[PDB]
Design a protein around this ligand. Structure first.
Ligand SMILES: [K+]
Ligand SMILES: [Mg+2]
Ligand SMILES: [Mg+2]
Length: 135
RNA sequence: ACAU
DNA sequence: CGATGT
């Protein structure tokens, strides 16, 4: 119904899927960029969306912030809820980095607690998420 | 089908 | 058009 403006919004950007993956988190109210991940040479859109949420969780926890996180990714929200990223991406030498980060993000989820609500950004009603890359 |  | 996901 109503955007919760006091929130963090995250999104992935890619060149190819699979392809080069990056992500960022922004203040939903102002668009201020709060974190950005260095591009990862090969990953999937959903792995990036998943890493972006988990990074958001870690970012907010470190700062003692109870703000919710918005993501537009049904998939990544579910993967975080499950603490398991069910990616189809082949595990080989060229995908090792993204899979290391995904594995480490799962590991963080399995060893830490959080109350952060992870909310679906309703793109159909509200337009593009504020963290979008514009491509 | 829906979400990317 | 192609790909990633539930
Ligand atoms: K984009
Ligand atoms: Mg997205
Ligand atoms: Mg986007």
């Amino acid at each position: 119904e109503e955007i919760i403006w006091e929130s963090l919004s995250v999104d992935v950007g890619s060149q190819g899927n699979p392809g080069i993956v990056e992500y960022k988190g922004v203040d939903t109210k102002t668009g201020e960029v709060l974190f950005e991940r260095e591009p990862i040479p090969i990953g999937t859109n959903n792995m990036g969306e998943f890493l972006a949420i988990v990074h958001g969780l870690r970012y907010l926890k470190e700062r003692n912030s109870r703000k919710p996180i918005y993501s537009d990714s049904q998939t990544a929200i579910k993967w975080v809820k499950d603490k398991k990223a069910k990616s189809t991406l082949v595990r080989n030498e060229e995908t090792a980095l993204i899979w290391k980060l995904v594995d480490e993000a799962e590991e963080w989820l399995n060893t830490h607690t959080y109350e952060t609500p992870i909310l679906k950004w309703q793109t159909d009603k509200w337009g593009e998420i504020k963290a979008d890359y514009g491509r």
